[PDB]
Design a protein around this ligand. Structure first.
Ligand code: ZN
Lengths: 157, 493, 219, 361, 359
């Protein structure tokens, strides 16, 4: 089936002991190595396994911090969730070529570039949009990220 | 022409081509429709027929109009009374002869290719076209060439002139089930006839061949008159000696006499332009200042539906509005509650050289007489969605100077317009053929939705190969923005 | 009942003519009679000079064209146009001499990605039988192309042979159904005409005369 | 079998081998996806105007047609339209040499664009005999056209293989010469992503000032070339003439498609790449394998391998079902999983040419 | 054989050898994978303006559309030998543009002017002054012998190699040069992802400045070049082949050693080439498709690149049975089964080239 937002909450409420283990990781396949991860993800979850890549990416992104990624519900007026490009653009901390490099990145490199971007950004966004794009992470999603960023940064000017 | 027996036709349901005199056409129940190898010449033919029919038989009452349509306008005697005119000879008389001038024989000689519009206009013609269409020509196949050249074609430049509507003027004719009905349906009732060219007192009703063009620099103008204008042929050419019994190069048929050349010379004159032609619409433009009147001509490669509004919708200044052709204007008054079947054709030109030729049959259902505003709407819609795509891709290519975005830059709008136009040709004429004008704006909405989807898809398609470079993925953000900024102003309803 | 020969036209690009004397050379959404006649003409080996066999072929056979919209990975691929910009070095300022321009330019419209299924049957006044055409279409003696030499075939002309009463009933036997249809016959309960100048005027080259298709729609 | 099918898969380094009026790469939409394209006209010009073509078809033994050697047949075929002395007047006019007995044929076989062309001359000298302009006077008028046919009477193979040059000065329906080789548009087997070279023009005198800005579009692709030869037509238009000679001519086309590239922007870019795969196949009917690539070929380790694979796989299932029963042979620089035992694998191009020369035996 | 093929594998430390309009690295997509690229047009210029070019080939051509500046320059250098008005008429004939003052005159597009030919043309115009034949007549006379004009081209060799094209004046009739060198854009043998240098400018007086980016990347580049010797002979005035090969060797040397100078102050990628192969052939061939399958690292990209190049070369040579004169120069000889000659040093390779595939 599909992965809930309950993962986000579960990440929020888990103890610092485990979270320190997960936060302490350079790349996602290294996330695969440690136990607290399997313990975290067992419900959602391992071993479908069609989900596993998505879960590695999602947890790896969440791993940035307790409140690095903040979840904001779609406003009734907008009826669209604020999305990662818009968020990174909104924060104002992020420089666009570091996103261009994100678009250019490949496999393990892309997530690592990304995790680095959020911590510096401390973004607010609709978590399942990030989940949805992270689940596929096709070229279309990559491109949409940049489009969103440029457009909102231009609107914000 | 009347006695001459020159007209080529085929019966409606099944046929072998036959050659005819104006008499049997006007006096018959048989359903005939025109038949030639080329459509532009068919249009020229029918324009000739409508011109002469208009000249000989223009009169009230509207009842007579309808009656002439449904019941043939002559027992032989009734028509035979109708032709006093003996201007249609090109037997030839030394005095008149032939819808062109005589004398002024200035060798050397020129083949008949030049009068057939399409061929030998340009270089690619010599390359891409079949040879030997100009060897031999006939009474009909030639007369049609001459009229067509005088009115609907712009040849030959170089101190020659094209009159009177202009060069590349477009025609608009109402069509009926049979040639007979058709030729009449575009004739102007004596009062409708009287309204447009009544002034009369400075009349000349004498053709260029009966009475000649007044030499040079004249001026006078606006006193052309009912007849002398419609058969105005300024080519100033003496058609060469006829020959032979053999096939027309293009009539395709055996003929008793044939023509293998013509003789030409330079004639100059100039006229103040306000001459009201029943056959074509004209467009009224104001700047600054003094008004600008000229006749509709095809200017671009665009689909014909784009022109529709100009063809069947009258307008008044200063909105700046067009004026529809008189024949159409008449037809709408005489038979409301009847659908139109318009036929329109014309050329695209540079100098001698013909670039595109369009001949069309356009369909409308009932309401077009009343609230043809709806008709104007669909055109402006279809164009409104086009210009959105074009502007978006122009921005994608040239780019936004501020705030410092760099553009692609390749010309993508140009190739996308063609796709749009091609796929639009399917959807816009087709609806406009079948709309219940009375209560049909949901149809327009589904149209806007389809055009919307088309613009989205073409925009994405045209940009797709270049959008792998963040350099340009940034520009298409703004470009896509302009696209939807443009698309939003159109759709909601 | 009626004997049919069923053929398929399957290039990655196609060109089917429309009226022109200028450099710009357009196309339509489906084949033309002159095209199909020329196509079998090629398959049968008919040279351009002998009016006899041409006229014979034209009188002998009548066609029906079904448009096959393309499906791959269950997504419909609608037909599309090209405009090839097409120059020539040389040539032929005149039909007679050895004199030429440096460059003439021409524009040429093409069709992608289009497939057609086509049924042909014998006229009453036929000068041949369907089996000759079968034999000729399976083993051509001149190169079959659609409808410029630039564009080759990706599926053989021969698709099959049938017995049926109407061409529709004949086309239904063959696989991609639901396409729009253009016939010279007849058909009961269907009204609409479509006009085209694709009837080759065989007596006079190289020009064409007006004809009409009966239009049919499955859904 | 009458038809020879040549399929080539050739990959190209970044370049712009063919352009539209607006300096953009020619493209085509196939399988619903954009493909970069090289027009047939460009390929054919590249072939026709190549040195190899000039060497092997310009300098071919069958290039000269001797009119003295066709007196018998020309009289035979034109006896019905003209009178023998008019024919003789024409041939004597064209060759400028009368009536000597030539022990050679009299081939009983005559290319139709020649009888077609000379017939027109017979028509002219006939009514010229009517008028009557004496031969010296008329020679003056037909001076261009005679030269025009005389040059054509020396390019038999060239005209037969590739079709008239025009301008060839030929004036009859039979003189519209086509074939014998049909050349397809070359389209990429995969959807392409296009690179825009954003260049500049530096002035030595105003060197430290803003520059001259220009854009050129390039792209690298794996192109599928298809070509076709109608042997019967080649013999007919050429001879005569024996099959073996026609096959000898075919091998040259096979070589050229494998090696020849259009010269567009080859100075500034240099896509001088040789064909990575070539198949030759004999058939009753011409077929192109473009539908192997209808589903756009996606990269695993470049486009070339998966393209070869796709082609191979398509050929395997499709070929038998269609008219392609026999006989076909393939030249590859390398792959595993060759397409099937059915086709002979050829180590070199020369061996393939030889295979073709011996009628695919 | 008429065609000489030059193949170079050159590796570069982190640099930015050529730039986009957005000061981004020039790139190209090959085998579906991104590659860093160096324009041919840039390489050619790097060659023309090189020190080595001045040392061994001579005067680089003067490309500008500023005719007003060129009036003065030509008057300065040709003033002692000619009269200024004659110079003026000569230029006016050559560019089609009128030369007076007119502070700013300008040309259709940037054209390569060599001074020697202009001097020669001035002499022709002096001989034109005697008759005086109307300019068209003089042109009719000068169209007859192009080679004479081309002999003057032994100064300005770069034009002979890369060619010039005229739209305006008499350079359209006399000045059209084609060939003789074909040069590819230089592309990496492997896939690249480009490193972003995030630099700052420190304000000494108030030392919180902010951020600028320069995109760099290190790569192993494959350069290809081609010379049509016959065409070069034609372009130089019929010059002997023996002379043409020397120029070719100079081109080989430059192609092996010269690097574009863009950003070389801040990034000093002054590396020579780890491989150079030269081969004579009837037809031009490029080995780019050896790298269509982007080369994956074993011990750097260079090693597998050399290997790939050699294997592809073997396949092509055997498949197309190219019997050719071929010679290879490597720094890392580590080995081809192919019957191609190994040269220990560049100078020996050059000598091999000078002596027409000497064995
Ligand atoms: Zn006629």
């Amino acid at each position: 089936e599909i992965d809930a937002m309950a993962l986000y909450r579960a990440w929020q409420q888990l103890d610092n002991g485990s979270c320190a283990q997960i936060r302490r990781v350079s790349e996602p396949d290294e996330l695969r190595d440690i136990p607290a991860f399997y313990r975290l993800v067992q419900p959602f979850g391992w071993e479908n396994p069609r989900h596993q890549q998505a879960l590695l990416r999602m947890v790896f992104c969440l791993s940035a911090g307790k409140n690095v990624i903040r979840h904001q519900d779609k406003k009734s007026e907008q009826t669209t969730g604020i999305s990662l490009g818009r968020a990174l653009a909104n924060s104002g901390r992020i420089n666009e070529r570091r996103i261009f490099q994100l678009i250019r990145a490949d496999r393990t490199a892309d997530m690592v570039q990304l995790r680095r971007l959020l911590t510096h950004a401390e973004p607010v966004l609709d978590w399942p949009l990030m989940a949805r794009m992270l689940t596929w992470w096709g070229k279309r999603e990559r491109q949409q990220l940049l489009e969103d960023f440029v457009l909102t940064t231009n609107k914000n000017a | 022409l009347l006695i001459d027996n020159w007209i080529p036709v085929r019966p409606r349901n099944g046929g072998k081509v036959q050659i005819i005199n104006l008499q049997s056409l006007y006096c018959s129940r048989d359903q005939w429709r025109l038949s030639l190898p080329r459509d532009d010449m068919e249009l020229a033919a029918l324009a000739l027929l409508v011109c002469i029919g208009q000249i000989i038989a223009p009169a009230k009452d509207d009842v007579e109009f309808r009656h002439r349509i449904m019941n043939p306008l002559t027992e032989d005697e009734f028509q035979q009374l109708i032709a006093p005119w003996i201007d249609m000879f090109y037997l030839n008389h030394a005095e008149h002869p032939f819808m062109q001038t005589k004398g002024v024989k200035a060798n050397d000689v020129t083949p008949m290719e030049k009068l057939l519009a399409g061929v030998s206009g340009a270089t690619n013609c010599a390359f891409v076209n079949q040879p030997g269409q100009g060897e031999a020509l006939c009474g009909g196949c030639t007369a049609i060439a001459l009229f067509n050249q005088a009115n609907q074609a712009p040849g030959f430049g170089g101190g020659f002139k094209s009159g009177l509507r202009g060069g590349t003027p477009v025609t608009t004719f109402v069509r009926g089930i049979d040639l007979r009905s058709t030729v009449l349906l575009n004739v102007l009732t004596l009062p409708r006839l009287q309204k447009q060219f009544p002034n009369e007192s400075h009349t000349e009703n004498q053709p260029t061949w009966i009475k000649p063009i007044k030499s040079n620099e004249s001026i006078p103008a606006s006193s052309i008159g009912f007849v002398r204008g419609l058969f105005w042929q300024p080519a100033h050419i003496e058609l060469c000696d006829p020959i032979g019994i053999g096939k027309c190069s293009c009539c395709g048929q055996e003929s008793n006499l044939r023509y293998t050349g013509f003789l030409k010379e330079k004639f100059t004159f100039t006229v103040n332009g306000l001459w009201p032609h029943p056959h074509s619409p004209c467009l009224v433009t104001v700047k600054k200042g003094e008004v600008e009147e000229k006749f509709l001509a095809f200017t671009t490669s665009a689909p014909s539906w784009t022109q529709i509004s100009r063809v069947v919708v009258d307008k008044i200044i200063q909105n700046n509005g067009n004026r529809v052709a008189a024949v159409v204007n008449q037809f709408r008054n005489i038979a409301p509650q009847s659908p139109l079947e318009l036929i329109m054709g014309g050329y695209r030109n540079n100098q001698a050289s013909i670039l595109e030729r369009r001949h069309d049959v356009l369909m409308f259902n009932q309401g077009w007489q009343q609230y043809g505003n709806v008709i104007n709407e669909i055109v402006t819609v279809g164009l409104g969605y086009k210009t959105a795509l074009r502007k978006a891709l122009y921005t994608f290519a040239e780019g936004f100077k501020n705030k410092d975005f760099k553009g692609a830059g390749v010309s993508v709008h140009e190739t996308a317009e063609r796709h749009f136009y091609r796929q639009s040709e399917l959807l816009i004429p087709d609806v406009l053929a079948n709309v219940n004008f009375s209560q049909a704006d949901e149809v327009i909405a589904d149209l806007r939705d389809k055009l919307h989807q088309l613009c989205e898809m073409l925009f994405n398609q045209s940009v797709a190969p270049y959008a792998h470079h963040p350099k340009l993925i940034s520009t298409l953000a703004l470009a896509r923005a302009t696209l939807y900024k443009h698309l939003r102003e159109l759709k909601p309803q | 009942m009626r004997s049919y020969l069923i053929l398929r036209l399957a290039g990655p690009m196609q060109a089917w003519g429309q009226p022109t004397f200028e450099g710009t050379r357009p196309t339509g959404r489906f084949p033309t009679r002159s095209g199909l006649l020329g196509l079998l003409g090629a398959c049968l080996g008919i040279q351009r000079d002998d009016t006899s066999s041409l006229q014979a072929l034209s009188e002998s056979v009548q066609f029906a064209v079904r448009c096959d919209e393309l499906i791959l990975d269950d997504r419909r691929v609608s037909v599309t146009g090209l405009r090839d910009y097409h120059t020539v070095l040389g040539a032929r300022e005149d039909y007679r001499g050895l004199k030429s321009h440096e460059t003439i330019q021409t524009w040429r419209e093409y069709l992608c990605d289009a497939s057609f299924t086509v049924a042909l049957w014998l006229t009453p006044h036929a000068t041949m039988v369907i089996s000759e055409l079968e034999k000729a279409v399976l083993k051509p003696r001149y190169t079959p192309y659609l409808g410029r030499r630039s564009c080759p075939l990706t599926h053989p002309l021969f698709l099959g042979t049938c017995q049926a009463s109407d061409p529709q009933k004949a086309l239904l036997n063959y696989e991609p159904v639901g396409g729009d249809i253009y016939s010279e016959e007849s058909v009961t309960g269907h009204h609409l005409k479509f006009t085209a100048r694709d009837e080759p005027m065989i007596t006079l080259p190289r020009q064409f005369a007006s004809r009409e298709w009966y239009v049919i729609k499955g859904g | 079998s009458n038809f020879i099918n040549i399929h080539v898969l050739i990959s190209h380094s970044p370049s712009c081998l063919n352009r539209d009026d607006m300096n953009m790469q020619k493209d085509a939409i196939f399988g619903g996806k954009r493909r970069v394209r090289i027009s047939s006209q460009s390929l054919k010009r590249a072939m026709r105007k190549s040195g190899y073509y000039a060497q092997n078809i310009g300098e071919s033994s069958l290039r000269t047609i001797h009119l003295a050697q066709l007196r018998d047949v020309l009289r035979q075929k034109l006896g019905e339209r003209f009178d023998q002395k008019i024919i003789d007047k024409t041939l004597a006019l064209l060759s400028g040499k009368s009536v000597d007995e030539a022990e050679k044929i009299s081939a009983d076989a005559v290319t139709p664009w020649v009888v077609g062309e000379i017939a027109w001359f017979c028509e002219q000298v006939a009514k010229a005999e009517a008028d009557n302009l004496d031969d010296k006077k008329l020679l003056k008028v037909l001076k261009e056209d005679i030269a025009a046919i005389r040059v054509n009477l020396q390019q038999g193979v060239d005209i037969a293989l590739s079709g008239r040059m025009a301008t060839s000065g030929m004036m009859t329906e039979l003189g519209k010469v086509d074939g014998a080789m049909s050349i397809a548009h070359a389209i990429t087997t995969h959807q392409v992503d296009s690179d825009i070279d954003w260049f500049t023009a530096v002035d030595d005198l105003q060197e430290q000032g803003s520059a001259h800005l220009g854009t050129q579009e390039f792209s690298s692709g794996v192109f599928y070339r298809y070509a076709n030869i109608n042997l019967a037509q080649l013999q007919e238009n050429l001879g005569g003439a024996s099959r073996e000679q026609a096959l000898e001519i075919a091998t040259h086309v096979v070589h050229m498609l494998a090696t020849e590239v259009p010269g567009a922007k080859q100075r500034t870019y240099a896509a001088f790449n040789p064909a990575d795969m070539v198949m030759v196949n004999f058939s009753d009917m011409p077929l192109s394998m473009a539908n192997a690539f209808e589903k756009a070929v996606k990269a695993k380790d470049g486009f070339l391998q998966p393209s070869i694979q796709a082609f191979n796989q398509y050929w395997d299932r499709v070929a038998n079902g269609y008219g392609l029963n026999g006989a076909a042979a393939q030249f590859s620089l390398s792959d595993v999983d060759p397409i099937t035992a059915q086709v002979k694998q050829m180590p070199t191009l020369e061996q393939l040419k030889s295979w073709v020369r011996n009628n695919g035996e």
